[PDB]
Design a protein around this ligand. Sequence first.
Ligand SMILES: [Ca+2]
Length: 227
Amino acid sequence: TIPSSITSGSIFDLEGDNPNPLVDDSTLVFVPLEAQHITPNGNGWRHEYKVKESLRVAMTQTYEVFEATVKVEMSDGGKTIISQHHASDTGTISKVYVSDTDESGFNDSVANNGIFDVYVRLRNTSGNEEKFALGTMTSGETFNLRVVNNYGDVEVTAFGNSFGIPVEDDSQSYFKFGNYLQSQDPYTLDKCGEAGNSNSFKNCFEDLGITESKVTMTNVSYTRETN
Ligand SMILES: [Ca+2]
């Protein structure tokens, strides 16, 4: 069953109220094309859970483990962030992607061919992102995701591949997970749409041919200890 920290809101706040991700006691379904949740600075639509403001502390002050069995069904060319450590500012600290773009450096890296790269970017102590390819998948396939924050040393494992480094600390950091669909051309990597304008993203996803984007998470666990 889905942990109560999620289902009850004791730890996580929901972004995108409808539909609710809990489709049965053991399954989370994140569908940003339906939830269509936005923020002032966002660059797409999201359906996502986030650690609530009151519990946030420095990356170096918690031990967190998130694990999930993740199935992804998404139109060719789609790109989403399915888990991330977010900074206090607009920064990010860790991001895990499922992505069908021409961005170089991954196992596929071929735009719009239905083969999604699964990779991670981790922001190091110098403030620079390091990226690492974990695997590839086609729509409908499933993989295992494990994200660990060991007091500032962040590790991601998927498809049996692991990568981790110490990350730039942020005093009010927070973990999020779900399906944050990115409004971006997969060929050119140009962003599409206008911040805060939900209709703009509507039109972007139509033009990008993104008519399916469903992240299903099962066998989910989350632990959090603070120091
Ligand atoms: Ca591809």
